[PDB]
Design a protein around this ligand. Structure first.
Ligand code: CA
Ligand code: CL
Ligand code: NA
Length: 225
């Protein structure tokens, strides 16, 4: 039971979506402060995103997601994917593409460890790049061309600061902060903050690791879900 199974940052400034099982919350956050606030109380994914009702993303829920551009995002559940427009503040949310399987959405992932499911992913600052994580492996993909960038690598090799930590063999969830170029990584009950610089994964800065319920105290008594 990882506390947070998926996360992606909103088109709304300093807002983020955290998913756990078939449910989610929408938070307003402030880097540097423990002052985070719930804007949308824990509820069914299908309630917050009606276009997802009757799909793997509603039940059992979203296990990986990343922000792309505008109010669009990629979501996953097992071996399934959808490109969606969540249209913040309106009844106009919709699936642009899918549901389809991961390999159908991204043929470059066919016959890889990513085909059957993806642990987590976050939006890079460079071009249209996105970091995908599955076990102890990661790879960058450009979401527009849908082509891979670089080789599939061990997290520990691509990110030496994460080598030896609990993130080395996997990342349960993560998202790109509105404060660039930072990201948050989540593993089990813990999380950490990073400062990354595209191309130079080796030059990643990492903070000390903390329990989720201490860094985001507002989730206390709500998470684990
Ligand atoms: Ca996950
Ligand atoms: Cl994620
Ligand atoms: Na993201």
């Amino acid at each position: 039971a990882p506390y947070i199974n998926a996360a992606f940052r909103s088109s709304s400034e300093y807002e983020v979506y955290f998913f756990a099982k078939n449910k989610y919350v929408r938070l307003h956050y402030t880097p540097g402060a423990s002052s985070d606030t719930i804007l949308t109380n824990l509820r069914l994914i299908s309630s917050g995103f009606p276009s997802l009702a009757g799909t793997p993303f509603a039940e059992p829920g979203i296990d990986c997601s990343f922000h792309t551009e505008a109010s669009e995002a990629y979501v996953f559940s097992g071996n399934h994917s959808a490109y969606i427009d969540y249209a913040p503040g309106t009844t106009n949310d919709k699936i642009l593409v899918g549901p389809t399987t991961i390999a159908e959405m991204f043929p470059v992932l066919n016959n890889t460890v990513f085909e059957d499911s993806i642990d987590s992913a976050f939006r890079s600052t460079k071009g249209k790049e996105v970091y995908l994580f599955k076990g102890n492996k990661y790879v960058r993909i450009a979401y527009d061309s849908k082509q891979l960038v670089g080789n599939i690598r061990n997290i520990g090799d691509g990110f030496p600061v994460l080598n030896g930590t609990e993130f080395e063999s996997g990342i349960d969830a993560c998202f790109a902060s509105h404060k660039e170029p930072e990201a948050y990584l989540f593993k089990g009950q813990n999380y950490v903050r990073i400062d990354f610089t595209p191309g130079g994964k080796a030059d990643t800065l990492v903070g000390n690791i903390r329990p989720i319920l201490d860094g985001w105290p507002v989730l206390k008594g709500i998470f684990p879900v």
